[PDB]
Amino acid sequence: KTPYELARERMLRSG
Amino acid sequence: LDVPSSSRYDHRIRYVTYNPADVVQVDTVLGVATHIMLEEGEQYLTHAFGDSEAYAFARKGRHIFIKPQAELANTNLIVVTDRRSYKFRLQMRNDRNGAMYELAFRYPDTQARQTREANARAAVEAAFEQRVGAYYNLKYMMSGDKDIAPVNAWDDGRFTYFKFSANADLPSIYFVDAEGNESLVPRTTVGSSNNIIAVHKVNPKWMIRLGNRALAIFNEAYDPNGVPNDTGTASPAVRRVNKGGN
Amino acid sequence: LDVPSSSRYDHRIRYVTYNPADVVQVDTVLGVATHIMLEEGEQYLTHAFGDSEAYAFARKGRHIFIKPQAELANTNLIVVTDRRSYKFRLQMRNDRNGAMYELAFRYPDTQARQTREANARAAVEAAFEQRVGAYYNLKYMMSGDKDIAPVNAWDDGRFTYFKFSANADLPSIYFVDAEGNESLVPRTTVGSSNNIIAVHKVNPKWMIRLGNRALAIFNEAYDPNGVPNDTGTASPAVRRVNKGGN
């Protein structure tokens, strides 16, 4: 779980 | 496919002309929210995605807000409004480059229809004002309290006019029968400076009254035949049509 | 992509020139509160993030507070108000340097609008006061209770002005018909020290009363012709146009 992926998934799920 | 052209300052702000015969291309990247502006006063009904989950749609008034929540966001947007419907091709861009921060429409249809209606009203107004084929009668006569008399009076064959000096009060004008009774008549005030009063009947006799002072206007050339008003309006070059059908 | 101009005291306060065709870059460092000040009288509609969880948003009226709360926050904001819609390109600053504490907008559009309409009243007031191309008639007789006499009387072809000494009690004026019947006439008060009363009519007679004292005014050169009020304003230089449309 690289932090870039953290940013991507948080971006995706966010409204 | 219509692709919008960006503004000269920023490549993110792109302007495009709406057309019902083609669908707007929207190139969305991840992490941007696109602002869509509907035509002013447009009334949104409903919309449709390929995936309701792929993009979020929050709308208040005429403003449309979108953003992809899932990868491979490749679907369509079909939003319908009262006047038209907008169509979009939301295409996901994997490089997160070249964003679409907004999209504003330059409508040809609404202004195109407006110009036609303005042209029609202009033709109508020109038809009224042109006022050709008009004969004028000036043989008018008075007797009585001259102090409030009009400066001029004449008839076009349909209406009778009285012009009053700009310093004088506007008097009340009454219709006179052949017997000697008096009857109200509708009056409309025309002219550049509201110094011309128009009554809607060509008649042999007229009484003008104000305060305690009266003046009787006599027509010396009352022509009973007149001109038929067969077009249903003050102009000979404008008709009146029954649009209601039925 | 306008970068806001640093305040001369501190670069942490930045001003930027607004534009509806450009997006302003926002530099945010970790853990500072970003202050946005909207111009007075903006009615906030709604906004949109690229990541609702990335940045912390608080608003009351024309004040917007932005704060990153999630690492690696590269998103954008679209805030819409009744007048305009502001656009921002947020880049998260990685070194906690070059922080920007507050952003303020300069609006050349509002300045351009208000300066133009300021010149509008400039022209209106100049046209009103200039009053050139107007003639004055002074032939006026008088009789009655001389103690309440107006020190001077004259007419401009549209109004009639009466003036009184600073110790003179301002009387009432009644408009006289041909038969001797008195009736009201609207009066407006102008002049440096409220020593000018102007009546809104020109008449070959006038009468002035106060208590049980009276006085008559004669217009020795009453011109019934006059000049038509071609524009609906006290000046011949102020056109009067129909705003309401519909």
Side-chain angles (χ1 to χ4, degrees):
Chain A
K1 273 309 160 57
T2 197
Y4 171 40
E5 294 294 328
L6 305 179
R8 293 251 280 181
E9 61 205 309
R10 163 177 45 75
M11 210 205 66
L12 294 174
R13 58 182 169 83
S14 65
Chain B
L1 288 175
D2 303 90
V3 60
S5 178
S6 305
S7 66
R8 293 183 292 111
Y9 314 94
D10 194 22
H11 65 265
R12 296 177 181 84
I13 291 160
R14 306 189 193 172
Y15 295 162
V16 63
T17 78
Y18 162 80
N19 183 245
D22 192 357
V23 170
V24 169
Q25 183 62 255
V26 173
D27 299 331
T28 180
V29 306
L30 277 300
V32 304
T34 310
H35 179 201
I36 308 301
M37 284 73 74
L38 311 184
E39 166 176 302
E40 293 82 3
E42 185 70 348
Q43 188 274 330
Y44 155 80
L45 280 75
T46 54
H47 64 268
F49 282 157
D51 292 337
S52 294
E53 57 85 22
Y55 293 96
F57 180 15
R59 189 215 45 106
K60 182 175 73 175
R62 48 182 276 263
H63 283 220
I64 284 172
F65 274 10
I66 68 183
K67 164 282 191 183
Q69 293 82 18
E71 272 77 350
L72 277 296
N74 307 295
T75 61
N76 74 324
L77 188 154
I78 305 298
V79 65
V80 304
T81 63
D82 63 358
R83 186 178 296 114
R84 56 183 88 77
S85 165
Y86 305 102
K87 305 151 301 314
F88 298 98
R89 183 180 182 272
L90 320 170
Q91 170 262 318
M92 191 285 258
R93 285 193 45 101
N94 63 7
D95 45 356
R96 202 184 206 273
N97 189 353
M100 294 299 291
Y101 274 33
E102 70 84 29
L103 194 53
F105 272 13
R106 198 153 32 199
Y107 297 88
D109 77 314
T110 179
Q111 63 74 50
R113 183 205 49 186
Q114 283 334 120
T115 54
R116 184 189 298 81
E117 311 324 328
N119 177 46
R121 301 207 337 268
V124 166
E125 291 275 50
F128 281 105
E129 62 78 13
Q130 59 86 31
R131 193 221 51 253
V132 69
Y135 182 76
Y136 290 103
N137 165 38
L138 292 153
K139 277 73 69 177
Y140 280 76
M141 190 67 203
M142 65 183 73
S143 77
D145 295 297
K146 315 187 67 41
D147 50 354
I148 62 172
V151 71
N152 275 132
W154 78 102
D155 64 74
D156 50 10
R158 170 144 317 147
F159 280 174
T160 305
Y161 304 110
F162 303 95
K163 199 218 296 187
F164 292 88
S165 60
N167 308 125
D169 301 328
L170 271 183
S172 184
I173 289 175
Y174 290 122
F175 179 96
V176 177
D177 63 352
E179 181 176 330
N181 310 298
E182 295 294 328
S183 65
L184 321 169
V185 65
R187 50 176 260 179
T188 60
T189 76
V190 306
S192 67
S193 48
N194 311 99
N195 52 0
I196 299 175
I197 188 166
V199 288
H200 293 339
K201 189 44 141 181
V202 176
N203 191 67
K205 196 166 181 239
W206 293 97
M207 185 180 288
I208 289 148
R209 290 194 160 273
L210 182 62
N212 189 359
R213 322 200 44 68
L215 168 83
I217 288 281
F218 292 165
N219 181 351
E220 291 292 328
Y222 175 72
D223 189 19
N225 300 338
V227 62
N229 187 343
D230 63 357
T231 49
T233 188
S235 158
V238 187
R239 255 205 295 286
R240 189 202 53 177
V241 290
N242 310 350
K243 70 179 181 67
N246 214 338
Chain C
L1 290 81
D2 291 331
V3 55
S5 179
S6 306
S7 297
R8 165 182 48 79
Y9 293 61
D10 208 26
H11 76 274
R12 294 176 179 88
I13 304 99
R14 301 176 192 172
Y15 318 120
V16 68
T17 82
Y18 175 83
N19 174 233
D22 191 356
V23 175
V24 178
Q25 194 280 334
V26 171
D27 284 331
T28 177
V29 298
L30 277 297
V32 304
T34 302
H35 178 200
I36 301 298
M37 261 174 67
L38 289 176
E39 70 92 23
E40 293 293 328
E42 288 297 338
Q43 273 324 310
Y44 159 80
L45 298 175
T46 316
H47 59 288
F49 277 22
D51 174 351
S52 292
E53 285 194 321
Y55 293 93
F57 188 107
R59 191 214 44 103
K60 155 168 68 146
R62 59 175 281 265
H63 289 291
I64 278 180
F65 304 71
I66 302 302
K67 170 200 170 151
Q69 43 174 20
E71 190 38 56
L72 189 62
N74 301 292
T75 67
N76 74 322
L77 266 66
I78 281 287
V79 60
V80 294
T81 57
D82 53 358
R83 287 178 231 187
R84 51 184 93 82
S85 164
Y86 308 85
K87 314 155 168 51
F88 316 90
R89 189 219 179 176
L90 282 70
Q91 262 155 19
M92 187 66 204
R93 306 289 335 284
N94 50 6
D95 291 331
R96 204 188 209 277
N97 283 320
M100 162 285 308
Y101 281 31
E102 175 271 354
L103 189 151
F105 263 120
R106 290 321 185 294
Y107 302 81
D109 57 357
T110 51
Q111 303 324 90
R113 179 195 294 87
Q114 65 183 357
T115 300
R116 184 173 42 86
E117 56 90 23
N119 175 39
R121 280 83 65 193
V124 172
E125 296 279 280
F128 265 121
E129 307 316 278
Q130 72 65 20
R131 65 203 171 142
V132 178
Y135 181 75
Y136 294 99
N137 166 35
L138 270 297
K139 315 312 150 283
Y140 273 84
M141 295 299 102
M142 182 179 72
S143 76
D145 297 297
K146 315 295 278 289
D147 56 354
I148 62 170
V151 187
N152 276 119
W154 72 98
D155 59 74
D156 46 10
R158 195 63 58 76
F159 283 160
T160 303
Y161 308 97
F162 295 88
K163 67 184 289 184
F164 300 85
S165 63
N167 285 342
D169 291 331
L170 281 182
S172 301
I173 295 171
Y174 293 107
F175 157 84
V176 171
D177 63 353
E179 291 326 290
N181 291 318
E182 323 170 312
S183 65
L184 277 296
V185 64
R187 53 182 261 185
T188 181
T189 302
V190 300
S192 67
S193 54
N194 303 298
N195 52 358
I196 301 299
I197 55 175
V199 293
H200 293 159
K201 186 71 169 299
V202 59
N203 188 68
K205 274 262 291 193
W206 300 91
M207 169 189 274
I208 316 166
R209 301 190 177 275
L210 166 70
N212 182 334
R213 321 210 53 77
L215 197 155
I217 300 298
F218 297 167
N219 179 357
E220 290 292 327
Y222 175 64
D223 188 16
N225 292 318
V227 290
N229 186 341
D230 291 331
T231 44
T233 60
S235 178
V238 189
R239 183 71 61 101
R240 196 199 60 184
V241 297
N242 294 316
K243 185 162 73 54
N246 209 338

